[PDB]
Design an enzyme around this catalytic site. Structure first.
Site, PDB file in Angstrom:
ATOM      1  N   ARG A 225     -12.683  14.010   7.370  1.00  0.00           N
ATOM      2  CA  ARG A 225     -12.831  12.886   6.461  1.00  0.00           C
ATOM      3  C   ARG A 225     -14.071  12.051   6.744  1.00  0.00           C
ATOM      4  O   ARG A 225     -14.833  11.732   5.829  1.00  0.00           O
ATOM      5  CB  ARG A 225     -11.595  12.009   6.592  1.00  0.00           C
ATOM      6  CG  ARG A 225     -11.534  10.892   5.619  1.00  0.00           C
ATOM      7  CD  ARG A 225     -10.491   9.867   6.029  1.00  0.00           C
ATOM      8  NE  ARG A 225     -11.099   9.103   7.091  1.00  0.00           N
ATOM      9  CZ  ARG A 225     -10.768   9.151   8.373  1.00  0.00           C
ATOM     10  NH1 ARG A 225      -9.738   9.869   8.797  1.00  0.00           N
ATOM     11  NH2 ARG A 225     -11.467   8.422   9.230  1.00  0.00           N
TER      12      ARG A 225
ATOM     13  N   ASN B 250       0.816  -1.209   0.000  1.00  0.00           N
ATOM     14  CA  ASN B 250       0.000   0.000   0.000  1.00  0.00           C
ATOM     15  C   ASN B 250       0.849   1.257   0.000  1.00  0.00           C
ATOM     16  O   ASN B 250       0.376   2.303  -0.440  1.00  0.00           O
ATOM     17  CB  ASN B 250      -0.968  -0.059   1.165  1.00  0.00           C
ATOM     18  CG  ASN B 250      -2.131  -1.019   0.867  1.00  0.00           C
ATOM     19  OD1 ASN B 250      -2.522  -1.167  -0.284  1.00  0.00           O
ATOM     20  ND2 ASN B 250      -2.639  -1.707   1.882  1.00  0.00           N
ATOM     21  N   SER B 251       2.103   1.173   0.432  1.00  0.00           N
ATOM     22  CA  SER B 251       2.959   2.349   0.421  1.00  0.00           C
ATOM     23  C   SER B 251       3.197   2.830  -0.993  1.00  0.00           C
ATOM     24  O   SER B 251       3.469   4.012  -1.202  1.00  0.00           O
ATOM     25  CB  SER B 251       4.304   1.979   1.078  1.00  0.00           C
ATOM     26  OG  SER B 251       4.139   1.639   2.451  1.00  0.00           O
TER      27      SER B 251
HETATM   28  C1  LIG Z   1      -4.524   4.118  -1.812  1.00  0.00           C
HETATM   29  C2  LIG Z   1      -3.947   4.563  -0.485  1.00  0.00           C
HETATM   30  C3  LIG Z   1      -3.609   5.881  -0.255  1.00  0.00           C
HETATM   31  C4  LIG Z   1      -3.018   6.277   0.955  1.00  0.00           C
HETATM   32  N1  LIG Z   1      -2.596   7.568   1.103  1.00  0.00           N
HETATM   33  C5  LIG Z   1      -1.934   7.868   2.202  1.00  0.00           C
HETATM   34  C6  LIG Z   1      -1.342   9.135   2.377  1.00  0.00           C
HETATM   35  O1  LIG Z   1      -1.302   9.972   1.511  1.00  0.00           O
HETATM   36  N2  LIG Z   1      -0.621   9.362   3.522  1.00  0.00           N
HETATM   37  C7  LIG Z   1      -0.594   8.497   4.554  1.00  0.00           C
HETATM   38  O2  LIG Z   1       0.002   8.816   5.542  1.00  0.00           O
HETATM   39  N3  LIG Z   1      -1.121   7.286   4.414  1.00  0.00           N
HETATM   40  C8  LIG Z   1      -1.763   6.993   3.312  1.00  0.00           C
HETATM   41  N4  LIG Z   1      -2.287   5.744   3.166  1.00  0.00           N
HETATM   42  C9  LIG Z   1      -1.971   4.736   4.187  1.00  0.00           C
HETATM   43  C10 LIG Z   1      -0.519   4.306   4.081  1.00  0.00           C
HETATM   44  O3  LIG Z   1      -0.121   4.368   2.693  1.00  0.00           O
HETATM   45  C11 LIG Z   1      -0.292   2.875   4.545  1.00  0.00           C
HETATM   46  O4  LIG Z   1      -0.852   2.727   5.850  1.00  0.00           O
HETATM   47  C12 LIG Z   1       1.184   2.533   4.639  1.00  0.00           C
HETATM   48  O5  LIG Z   1       1.763   2.775   3.358  1.00  0.00           O
HETATM   49  C13 LIG Z   1       1.397   1.072   4.984  1.00  0.00           C
HETATM   50  O6  LIG Z   1       2.780   0.849   5.088  1.00  0.00           O
HETATM   51  P1  LIG Z   1       3.343  -0.554   5.623  1.00  0.00           P
HETATM   52  O7  LIG Z   1       4.778  -0.553   5.353  1.00  0.00           O
HETATM   53  O8  LIG Z   1       2.804  -0.789   7.007  1.00  0.00           O
HETATM   54  O9  LIG Z   1       2.601  -1.671   4.721  1.00  0.00           O
HETATM   55  P2  LIG Z   1       2.512  -1.882   3.122  1.00  0.00           P
HETATM   56  O10 LIG Z   1       2.979  -0.674   2.395  1.00  0.00           O
HETATM   57  O11 LIG Z   1       1.149  -2.296   2.866  1.00  0.00           O
HETATM   58  O12 LIG Z   1       3.566  -3.040   2.873  1.00  0.00           O
HETATM   59  C14 LIG Z   1       3.320  -4.330   3.434  1.00  0.00           C
HETATM   60  C15 LIG Z   1       3.889  -5.340   2.481  1.00  0.00           C
HETATM   61  O13 LIG Z   1       3.927  -6.592   3.200  1.00  0.00           O
HETATM   62  C16 LIG Z   1       3.601  -7.597   2.286  1.00  0.00           C
HETATM   63  N5  LIG Z   1       3.135  -8.799   3.022  1.00  0.00           N
HETATM   64  C17 LIG Z   1       1.948  -8.963   3.660  1.00  0.00           C
HETATM   65  N6  LIG Z   1       1.806 -10.170   4.145  1.00  0.00           N
HETATM   66  C18 LIG Z   1       2.954 -10.839   3.797  1.00  0.00           C
HETATM   67  C19 LIG Z   1       3.394 -12.157   3.996  1.00  0.00           C
HETATM   68  N7  LIG Z   1       2.680 -13.075   4.634  1.00  0.00           N
HETATM   69  N8  LIG Z   1       4.605 -12.474   3.518  1.00  0.00           N
HETATM   70  C20 LIG Z   1       5.301 -11.555   2.848  1.00  0.00           C
HETATM   71  N9  LIG Z   1       4.971 -10.304   2.600  1.00  0.00           N
HETATM   72  C21 LIG Z   1       3.779 -10.004   3.091  1.00  0.00           C
HETATM   73  C22 LIG Z   1       2.519  -6.974   1.415  1.00  0.00           C
HETATM   74  O14 LIG Z   1       2.318  -7.702   0.231  1.00  0.00           O
HETATM   75  C23 LIG Z   1       3.050  -5.556   1.211  1.00  0.00           C
HETATM   76  O15 LIG Z   1       3.814  -5.411   0.026  1.00  0.00           O
HETATM   77  C24 LIG Z   1      -2.857   5.331   1.973  1.00  0.00           C
HETATM   78  C25 LIG Z   1      -3.276   4.018   1.752  1.00  0.00           C
HETATM   79  C26 LIG Z   1      -3.759   3.618   0.543  1.00  0.00           C
HETATM   80  C27 LIG Z   1      -4.155   2.170   0.359  1.00  0.00           C
HETATM   81 CL   LIG Z   2     -10.301  13.806   9.882  1.00  0.00          CL
HETATM   82 CL   LIG Z   3      -8.141  13.475   5.641  1.00  0.00          CL
END
Ligand SMILES: Cc1cc2nc3c(=O)[nH]c(=O)nc-3n(C[C@H](O)[C@H](O)[C@H](O)COP(=O)(O)OP(=O)(O)OC[C@H]3O[C@@H](n4cnc5c(N)ncnc54)[C@H](O)[C@@H]3O)c2cc1C
Ligand SMILES: [Cl-]
Ligand SMILES: [Cl-]
Ligand SMILES: Cc1cc2nc3c(=O)[nH]c(=O)nc-3n(C[C@H](O)[C@H](O)[C@H](O)COP(=O)(O)OP(=O)(O)OC[C@H]3O[C@@H](n4cnc5c(N)ncnc54)[C@H](O)[C@@H]3O)c2cc1C
Ligand SMILES: O=C(O)CCc1cnc[nH]1
Ligand SMILES: O=C(O)CCc1cnc[nH]1
Ligand SMILES: [Cl-]
Ligand SMILES: [Cl-]
Ligand SMILES: [Cl-]
Ligand SMILES: [Cl-]
Ligand code: NA
Ligand code: NA
Lengths: 454, 454
Positions: free
Chosen positions: B283, B42-43
């Site tokens: 929001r 999602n990042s």
């Molecule tokens: C469309 C969208 C827009 C957003 N916009 C914003 C914004 O502008 N600003 C903001 O602050 N937040 C925003 N958010 C939220 C934010 O982007 C996410 O919460 C954050 O990027 C998540 O980061 P992460 O590293 O925790 O997980 P992720 O970026 O989701 O990475 C997790 C990774 O782990 C992998 N994984 C999962 N399970 C397993 C497994 N069993 N084995 C191996 N790999 C696995 C997944 O496939 C994935 O690639 C947005 C979210 C979305 C969906």
């Molecule tokens: Cl808000």
């Molecule tokens: Cl917002």
């Protein structure tokens, strides 16, 4: 003993007085029955600030407003659950209601002051002289006496009388240990207020709001109008939506109108000597912030400089005396003494206020972004008050149409039965905005008396 | 097949990349295992706007901010349920995290643009070039390749390996139909993201968020890191707190970043041709407003004049093409055609826009009090998009300390186990503010790699 009137009104708050004056003006006979020994209910002890979009006061102050904005603010405030037609009719009639209070009832409002309650996009709450409902109820009482509207105190409605066609034709009430029958030739108006002071009804519909919370309301706010109407199959709705007010007495539950100094620079300080929420945030945000602080209470702190503009001490001297007697409020010379009386850490309080003083000078609150601007607190004397949230208003209640006719469980009008004010449940959705209860009770009280008199 | 590294990181989003770069920089061996065929989670598809109080961008723009205000905004945003130390550590490290992205990872941010998300008292969200996470993930990937951090795609972690002392010492993962054992000499970092795309887990913890709602996230956001850790008795918290985003595709669930024109004057129009909420309200208020409109959807409408300043069409051309192909978006010459394509009543739309044009000229929105000012919509062309809320972020998850160590059900550290990012459950309380996920994932991803490498 029996009495006969065209219109029998249950309750002497703003809704019932408005209905009674309209019924008499229509040329009908009418009475108000009131269970307490005194008139006015929660309307009496209210701040009685009343929202109006397009008022003479806004014009005097150069503030523009619109009915559309008042409607949208209100519906959004109640999470879009309020009945849009009930909100529209409230807003559409608000100017007329306030001008009627001014011109017919002779209520005096400040010509050049307004409050902006949470959720309102512009300042729009008219302020009665004295900043309480005392002015409103005292003027209503005088007008009622002039026009010949009788008010029977110590008279508790207990049962609606329903004839074989389903029409409500009277009320049985208790007075001095006997039942008195009030025959109503044209209509009965239920104007009994809310249930903030009925613990069992609160717990039935919202279990969180149990004995841990007081009530800001009078002892007569017990839901009797809902119970009596449900017995004849009136519908009710939204009964679980019950709001608190953040700044109330931990001992008695009473609202602290004296703490309206919050609108003029008073700061909220927790037991640790810290500022923890913007003092003008939305009402429920402040309540939740307070409940997150140690002990589930806050202090409210301000000085003579704030009182010299706000006048909330001068206007609420009964509260001053009572809260002080209860050990909930102190008047002190210095911040050091303010910390001592409530066992607040002195160095933390002094550092907090040093920051406040800087933010007051720059206009920029770097801790909580106070929306209107802080005021220097370096010089006393000071008042410090201990406060916690208390149950305040019951948004639910009886189902009515915009003509105040009470509806049964299939949506059919119950002939002869009307309801107005906090007893009804369709205007405010999940959350009533500050100042909107007074608009509701006057607009719909007037309509109820007009319709009942037809 | 088996592999051995000092630090085994599960997930290639911002948290996992941050942990991996820190572990390698500490002189340790490390790997990221990623279950999808592509990196970034999602990042990658995020807007990737990242809140920082005290940034170089705020300084360039003359905007003052403070850590205290960012902390208080965040805690209030989550209804005071977030862990104050987790919020403090996020805010205290945000400047360093953003400067590290800039200087070490070579992420390019606009020097003079910021977003102000709901609940933020000042503009504070840094904006990566392109207004998406594409810039962030592509630069992380390049830096990982430079420093020698391997990323094993198509590799799904299935089980944490726990030795007889309770220490986590590796991960079993599936790749091409076989199990591969990853021995972790120093630590395992769970950086797997949220569960917005796991329907059964959503329904378990928040039954409202069922099949009626899409997800804005990638297919891999399924909660696997929580499940694997719970199997070895890690604690989880706040799992029922799940947020939606208001403006998403009714067909796919995807967010509409193209509708960030809402920050620049785009209006929200319901099926009746009316404006129904301030377009810059909080929001969840916007989401609830949309769900109260006919059909539980809204239109988003703007013109070329807005695009010439906002650039959201130019920056999100994939969305333009996909939403248009799905019948959810149209580019039209006139307001009359905008009404026609979506069967909106023409006269109501035209009257609404006449009012908007007047409010744009005066700066005073007399219908909804738009906070930044409307923009004239009399001239086209126009884009009109159909949108509805979709499930977006799971605030709950694993219990960690501020050193990212995962705690068991008695609050004891599980040796060798760390977690960072949306998989954790203690930062955001009941409601994450916009832009705060990116701050969380970078700050805590870095800490997790630092701690795991010790
Ligand atoms: C469309 C969208 C827009 C957003 N916009 C914003 C914004 O502008 N600003 C903001 O602050 N937040 C925003 N958010 C939220 C934010 O982007 C996410 O919460 C954050 O990027 C998540 O980061 P992460 O590293 O925790 O997980 P992720 O970026 O989701 O990475 C997790 C990774 O782990 C992998 N994984 C999962 N399970 C397993 C497994 N069993 N084995 C191996 N790999 C696995 C997944 O496939 C994935 O690639 C947005 C979210 C979305 C969906
Ligand atoms: Cl808000
Ligand atoms: Cl917002
Ligand atoms: C302390 C306080 C401050 C407030 N401040 C504001 C404010 O500034 N602005 C605002 O808009 N709203 C405010 N509110 C809310 C608002 O004042 C009330 O909702 C409103 O006044 C209620 O009016 P009402 O006519 O429905 O009922 P009430 O004013 O409560 O009158 C109902 C009357 O009916 C009587 N009654 C009840 N049962 C029976 C029975 N069985 N038989 C006979 N009589 C009966 C009661 O004794 C009472 O006198 C405040 C409320 C309180 C408690
Ligand atoms: O409950 C309301 O409508 C406002 C309560 C109030 C606080 N100060 C004056 N009125
Ligand atoms: O979920 C967030 O933190 C913000 C979502 C977003 C909308 N436009 C860019 N980012
Ligand atoms: Cl004023
Ligand atoms: Cl509010
Ligand atoms: Cl309020
Ligand atoms: Cl900007
Ligand atoms: Na009510
Ligand atoms: Na989470």
């Amino acid at each position: 003993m029996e009495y006969t009137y065209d219109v029998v009104i249950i309750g002497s708050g703003g809704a019932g007085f408005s209905a009674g004056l309209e019924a008499i003006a229509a040329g009908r006979s009418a009475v108000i029955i009131e269970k307490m020994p005194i008139i006015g209910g929660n309307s009496l002890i209210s701040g009685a600030e009343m929202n109006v979009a397009g008022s003479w006061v806004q014009k005097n102050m150069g503030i523009t407003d619109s009915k559309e904005l008042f409607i949208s603010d209100t519906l959004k405030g109640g999470d879009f659950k309020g009945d849009p037609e009930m909100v529209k009719t409230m807003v559409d009639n608000a100017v007329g209601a306030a001008e009627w209070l001014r011109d017919y009832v002779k209520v005096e409002f400040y010509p050049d002051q307004l409050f902006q309650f949470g959720g309102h996009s512009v300042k729009r709450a008219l302020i009665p002289k004295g900043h309480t409902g005392a002015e409103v109820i005292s003027k209503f009482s005088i007008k009622a006496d002039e026009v010949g509207l009788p008010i029977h105190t110590n008279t508790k409605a207990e049962k609606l009388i329903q004839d074989q066609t389903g029409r409500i034709v009277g009320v049985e009430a208790a007075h001095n240990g006997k039942t008195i029958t009030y025959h109503a030739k044209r209509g009965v108006v239920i104007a009994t207020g809310g249930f903030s002071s009925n613990m069992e009804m609160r717990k039935k519909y919202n279990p969180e709001l149990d004995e841990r919370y007081g009530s800001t309301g009078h002892a007569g706010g017990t839901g009797d109008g809902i119970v009596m109407a449900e017995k004849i199959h009136a519908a009710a709705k939204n009964m679980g939506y019950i709001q608190s007010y953040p700044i109330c007495s931990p001992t008695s539950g009473a609202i602290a109108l004296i703490a309206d100094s919050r609108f003029f620079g008073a700061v909220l300080i927790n037991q640790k000597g810290e500022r923890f929420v913007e003092e003008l945030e939305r009402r429920d945000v402040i309540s939740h912030a307070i409940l997150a602080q140690p002990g589930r209470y806050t202090y409210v702190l301000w000085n003579q400089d704030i009182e010299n503009v706000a006048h909330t001490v001068e206007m609420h001297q009964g509260e001053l005396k009572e809260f002080t007697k209860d050990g909930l409020m102190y008047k002190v010379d210095t911040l050091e003494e303010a910390a001592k009386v409530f066992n607040i850490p002195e160095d933390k309080l002094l550092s907090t206020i040093k920051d406040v003083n800087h933010y007051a000078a720059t206009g920029k609150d770097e801790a909580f972004n106070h929306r209107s601007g802080l005021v220097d607190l370096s010089k006393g004397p000071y008042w410090i008050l201990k406060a916690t949230p208390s149950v305040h208003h019951t948004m639910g209640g009886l189902v009515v149409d915009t003509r105040t006719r009470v509806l049964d469980e299939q949506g059919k009008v119950i002939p002869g039965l009307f309801a107005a004010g906090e007893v009804t449940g369709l205007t405010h959705g999940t959350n009533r905005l500050g100042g909107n209860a007074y608009t509701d009770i006057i607009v719909y009280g007037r309509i109820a008396g007009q319709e009942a008199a037809k």
